[PDB]
Design a protein around this nucleic acid. Structure first.
Lengths: 489, 705
DNA sequence: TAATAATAGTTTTTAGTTTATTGGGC
DNA sequence: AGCTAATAAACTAAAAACTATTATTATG
């Protein structure tokens, strides 16, 4: 979807950060630096098509575009960029605190009125497409209003006003996390998670606007527009980008089939494909070849209906594909299917059709299940009720049944390994893992910006352990041995 | 895989005897077998074939064998099948005028196959025979054929025009095929063959009894020569006491060609002028070829392309740890999602062979999560050559040893978050009983399972998984199309691919009944730009036809052009134009004649009467004498009904002075010329007692009477 | 006199080839 | 004690969806 979200980290310029704030752990100065960078990095790998920046409201040395006092801009409103990470790395530790003294000092008053106003000006500056806007703010106090109410009034008044503008806010507890402690100026209209903020997302690039739409039909008389979305795919790799030896820029790739006849040139028209079949030379052109790849026009002829007798536990082609009735050009799509979405639990006879992605693609016998709802507690209607068109195997796809073909064996071993099977178990968290191999590469890739061997090597609860979960299930499994002579040597 | 095959073919008109709408089993079998051969050769499969015929006009089999081997023409011998041979199969093998025992040809097959099994490496012996049952049967050879299939152990397969397991169909069921309503020699051959072949193959016999149409569509020979799953050396380790070796096998694959469309030029038809050259210039305004080894392969990071080597990434990458396979997680079978899947292949895993203990353990292990309805999450690291795969293994049911199949499960990275409103709450549209019935009308009318009884498990009356990728044979169609016919363009549309895939017509017509009213219930409208782009096949319906103008060779086609951009000449040129249907410019120009007769000027009516009296010859010479006489009778009355003393008196004057009639529509004009005179005029009538108009009338009637 | 409208411009997949590769031998 | 084979990953082009645009005619 066209649209760009923006989130900006707002930090204060006064004492409170450099002091640990009644907590033996690292100062809110320190812990912020670590957390923001971690979530910075996550957003970087999340997207580059996104605008980022950080500013220090308050200052001892003015440094912003508009040159208003107590304003220190540190990051320009930027897309993610490795040099930025390069310059952000060195804020860490007491040395970073020294820099903070060098760059601005430490400690300066503030006025959220100007602070909020100039931030909106920052957003008014960017002309890019605008989807969403949010602010990450940091403080240790529960209320800046230990002074005249005019600032407090001005702050809250335009807090609603920027709410009319539509900026979602979240104040983090830099004091005692949670504890119902920090609530004095923020139980109002003003809108713990810190570790989960850092542990929020890792190695993901969000996509949008799913492709592959086509039109269905009932009989050759009528066709209906419908948008087919894709649920899942395989893991992709980033396209490698060639670079020069040391100036490190790409150069052309230029395939040019030279001729041994004269050293001259060849034409694609001169190219006509060949099958070397013994003495039977076969010479066909590309387009007649490409036409041979076609059998029928992109379309869906409905075969009919089919009960819940298929789905033999032997066949699965490429993953099925979401279907949604879209008013692309056929005026009226879901109005017909207003009667089938209900006709799902009350009717399990499924339907199938062959499918053609486009011309040059074989027709694909494919079966459909209309889709149901699992709207979650907070109205989370994941997998909207549509249709799921599963493929079906072809004759050439089916494999031979193994020739060794006999009857099963005793359940005396079932007795022993009952205790195995119900002892250790997991929750089937389908969201308990990613590709650790892949993200490690990312970790390897970007590691060449901070001079560290490999950062945050993570292998979550996805590999079994020869002793940890062996004995978590217990050596009872070691005790259960009822098949004599383990054939292994 | 390896096999031994001998081609026992049929030749005979009775064995090509058929009915319109159903192809000749001679040709049906030939199409299936050239399919076998094209798959045999195009896919580069090695086998030794041999061709023998029965019912041949004459015999070529050297073994007379008591004249039981007559009409047997041995054609091919042990060599790899070749395109010319298959071309011979298409060409030479045509239904003759001779019938010989199919069982005698069966003895031919065992003889040659036993000749060809002498020291020849073969992993399979198979026999191929097809006959529409119009040849004599026999019984004296039952013992020798049984001992041949029992001792020499040569497999065989065949099909009939009858299926054992309405509308005419090339591959579907046409008219009902009664194997009892046929002549008894067919049935006797049918009975003798079936008891033999259920004796040899056991229970592999009844399945290969199709109608020749059904074998023409679905699997008939594919299964006999099919690729078996290949072993995978693997091991299952659980805990630290027990570890069992396992063998994995793939079940689903994307069919593809090992070969490539080798590039040859059209002028030299060879690869020897297409030698590779791919060069890389510095892409600056100044091009500058960079040496390939000078490459650096960086990756995009944010807006930056951080330069990366390969050997580095070759080192600090992470990989799966070996060809290992062991379960990790557990949960019940109900938690799985039909939608939450990957795995382009399907993999079936069993124990390592020659070890029944591992099979017993797996068979025992299957029982647990089967009686427990349990599913296990097994980690899949097939080897170090890729990252580990992940997902749940589900049990597989079977009449024998069960199985487990690993399926990949979605990552967080690969999951889409496209969320959409629920149409159930769509206030804009609600299901109506009308569309409900429209939906229901096809729910019950249309189904592809066989539904007659509960004890009879529902099955696909028109199976779909028993049909391979259509492209490959369609490829094979054009390959032989060009191989046998180098000059012939593309192979034709070749309906039969649709027919093997066409829905059951009876079901389709059964669909035609409700879908018609269902459509008409709720017709729908569509927007524009829903059409293909080009249509430039030829400039017209056809290139051209060859007619041409003839019969006017005078050398004055023009150059004296009949210039043409109604007193006398316009009408005369119009009647000279009596060349197209002769019925025009005369039926409607008489009004012009009238208004030209208006007697406003003397030449007006004189040239008026000349035109008519010139028209009279035209219709005589333009075959319009019938309308001529029609107008003759018409004109006189038409000029007398509106009577004035000026015109008509002269009209009849000129008329009767030069009225000319020659027999047209019989003596009609002869009567017209025999009678052309006047009639006396009587006293005018008064008799007007309705208004005072008679006043002036009576005034006149009394002044001067 | 000047609103409207088919249109290609970027990626995104995706599928066809390309590769270097353990596997067993004897 | 000499010998190699299917193969995912990798590498390609290929068509597309979605944007974002621009001629095109009423209008005067």
């Amino acid at each position: 979807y066209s649209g760009r979200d923006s989130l900006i980290f707002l930090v204060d310029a006064s004492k409170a950060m450099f002091e640990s704030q009644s907590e033996d752990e690292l100062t809110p100065f320190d812990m912020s630096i670590q957390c923001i960078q971690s979530v910075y990095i996550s957003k970087i790998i999340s997207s580059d098509r996104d605008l980022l920046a950080v500013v220090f409201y308050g200052t001892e040395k003015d440094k912003n575009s508009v040159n208003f006092k107590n304003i220190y801009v540190l990051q320009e409103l930027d897309n993610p960029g490795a040099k930025r990470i390069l310059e952000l790395d060195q804020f860490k530790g007491q040395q970073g605190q020294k820099r903070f003294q060098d760059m601005m000092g430490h400690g300066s008053d503030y006025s959220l009125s100007e602070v909020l106003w100039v931030c909106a000006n920052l957003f008014s500056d960017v002309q890019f497409k605008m989807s969403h806007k949010r602010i990450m703010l940091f403080t240790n106090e529960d209320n800046p209003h230990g002074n005249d109410s005019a600032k407090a009034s001005r702050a809250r008044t335009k807090a609603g006003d920027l709410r009319d503008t539509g900026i979602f806010l979240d104040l983090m507890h830099l004091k005692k996390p949670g504890g119902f402690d920090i609530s004095l100026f923020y139980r109002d209209i003003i809108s713990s998670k810190l570790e989960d903020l850092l542990r929020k997302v890792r190695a993901k690039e969000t996509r949008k606007r799913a492709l592959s739409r086509l039109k269905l039909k009932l009989n050759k008389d009528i066709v209906i527009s419908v948008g087919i979305y894709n649920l899942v795919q395989k893991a992709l790799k980033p396209p490698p980008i060639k670079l020069y030896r040391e100036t490190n820029e790409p150069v052309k790739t230029k395939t040019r089939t030279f001729n041994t006849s004269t050293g001259g040139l060849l034409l694609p028209s001169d190219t006509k494909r060949s099958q070397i079949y013994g003495s039977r030379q076969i010479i066909l052109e590309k387009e007649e070849t490409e036409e041979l790849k076609r059998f029928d026009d992109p379309g869906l002829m409905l075969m009919g209906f089919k009960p819940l007798v298929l789905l033999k536990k032997h066949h699965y082609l490429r993953p099925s594909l979401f279907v949604y009735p879209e008013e692309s050009l056929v005026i009226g799509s879901s109005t017909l299917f207003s009667a089938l979405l209900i006709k799902c639990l009350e009717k399990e006879v499924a339907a199938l059709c062959r499918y053609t992605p486009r011309r040059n693609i074989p027709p694909y016998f494919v079966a459909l299940v209309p889709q149901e709802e699992e709207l979650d507690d907070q109205k989370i209607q994941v997998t909207p009720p549509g249709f799921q068109l599963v493929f079906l195997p072809f004759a050439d796809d089916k494999r031979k049944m193994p020739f060794t073909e006999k009857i099963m064996a005793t359940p005396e071993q079932v007795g022993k390994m009952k205790a195995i099977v119900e002892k250790l178990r997991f929750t089937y968290r389908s969201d308990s893992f990613e590709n650790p191999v892949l993200q490690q590469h990312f970790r390897n890739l970007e590691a060449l910006a901070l001079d560290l061997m490999e950062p945050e090597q993570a292998v979550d609860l996805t590999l079994p352990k020869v002793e940890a979960m062996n004995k978590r299930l217990g050596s009872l499994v070691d005790e259960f041995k009822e098949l004599v002579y383990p054939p292994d040597y | 895989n390896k096999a031994a095959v001998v081609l026992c073919m049929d030749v005979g008109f009775t064995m090509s005897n058929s009915i319109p709408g159903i192809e000749s089993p001679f040709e049906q079998a030939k199409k299936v077998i050239t399919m076998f051969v094209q798959r045999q050769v195009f896919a580069e499969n090695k086998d030794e074939i041999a061709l023998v015929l029965f019912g041949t006009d004459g015999t070529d089999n050297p073994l007379s064998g008591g004249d039981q081997y007559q009409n047997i023409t041995v054609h091919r011998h042990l060599m790899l099948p070749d395109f010319d041979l298959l071309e011979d199969i298409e060409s030479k093998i045509q239904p003759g005028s001779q019938q010989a025992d199919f069982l005698d040809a069966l003895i031919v097959s065992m003889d040659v196959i036993q000749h060809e099994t002498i020291g020849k490496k073969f992993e399979k012996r198979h026999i191929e025979i097809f006959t529409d049952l119009s040849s004599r049967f026999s019984k004296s050879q039952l013992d020798i054929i049984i001992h041949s299939l029992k001792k020499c152990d040569i497999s065989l397969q065949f099909f009939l025009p009858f299926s054992l397991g309405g509308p005419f169909r090339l591959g579907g069921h046409g008219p009902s095929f009664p194997l009892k309503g046929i002549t008894e020699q067919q049935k006797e051959g049918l009975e003798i063959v079936k008891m033999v072949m259920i004796s040899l193959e056991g229970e592999d016999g009844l399945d290969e009894i199709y109608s020749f149409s059904e074998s023409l569509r679905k699997l008939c020979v594919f299964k006999k020569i099919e690729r078996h799953s290949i072993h995978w050396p693997c091991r299952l380790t659980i805990g630290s006491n027990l570890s069992i070796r396992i063998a994995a096998y793939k079940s689903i694959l994307q069919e593809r060609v090992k070969k490539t469309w080798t590039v040859v030029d059209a002028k030299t038809l060879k690869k020897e002028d297409i030698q590779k050259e791919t060069v890389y210039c510095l892409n600056d305004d100044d091009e500058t070829e960079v040496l390939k080894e000078d490459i650096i392969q960086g990756f995009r990071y944010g807006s930056d392309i951080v330069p990366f080597s390969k050997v580095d990434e070759e080192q600090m990458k992470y990989k799966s740890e070996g060809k290992c396979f062991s379960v990790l997680g557990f949960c019940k079978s109900s938690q799985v999602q039909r939608r939450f899947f990957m795995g382009n292949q399907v993999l079936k895993v069993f124990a390592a062979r020659d070890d029944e203990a591992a099979a017993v353990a797996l068979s025992s292990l299957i029982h647990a999560l089967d009686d427990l309805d349990m599913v296990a999450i097994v980690r899949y690291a097939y080897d170090k050559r890729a990252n580990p795969q992940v997902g749940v293994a589900f049990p597989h049911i079977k009449h024998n040893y069960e199985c487990l199949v690993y399926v990949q499960l979605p990552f967080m990275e690969d999951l889409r978050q496209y969320m959409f409103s629920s149409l159930k709450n769509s206030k804009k549209y609600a299901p109506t009983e009308a569309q409900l019935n429209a939906v229901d009308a096809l729910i019950d009318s249309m189904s592809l399972a066989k539904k007659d009884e509960k004890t009879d498990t529902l099955e696909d009356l028109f199976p779909t998984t028993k049909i391979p990728n259509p492209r490959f044979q369609r490829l094979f169609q054009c390959l032989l199309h060009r191989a046998l016919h180098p000059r012939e363009p593309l192979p034709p549309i070749q309906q039969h691919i649709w027919n093997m895939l066409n829905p059951p017509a009876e079901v389709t017509t059964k669909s035609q009944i409700p879908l018609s009213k269902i459509k008409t219930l709720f017709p729908l409208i569509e927007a524009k730009k829903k059409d293909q782009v080009t249509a430039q096949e030829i400039f017209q319906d056809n290139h051209e036809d060859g007619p041409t103008a003839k019969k006017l060779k005078t050398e004055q086609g023009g150059a004296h052009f009949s210039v043409s951009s109604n007193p006398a000449e316009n009408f005369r040129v119009l009647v000279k134009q009596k060349k197209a249907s002769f019925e025009e410019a005369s039926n409607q120009l008489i009004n012009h004649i009238e208004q030209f007769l208006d007697t406003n000027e003397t030449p007006y009516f004189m040239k008026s009467i000349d035109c008519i009296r010139a028209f009279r010859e035209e219709a005589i010479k333009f075959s319009e004498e019938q309308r001529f006489n029609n107008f003759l009778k018409a004109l006189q009355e038409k000029v007398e009904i509106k009577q004035l003393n000026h015109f008509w008196e002269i009209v009849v004057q000129d008329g009767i002075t030069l009225i000319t009639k020659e027999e047209a529509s019989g003596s009609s004009v002869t009567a017209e010329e025999a009678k052309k005179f006047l009639a006396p005029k009587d006293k005018p009538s008064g008799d007007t007692a309705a208004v005072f108009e008679e006043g002036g009338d009576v005034d006149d009637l009394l002044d001067m009477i």
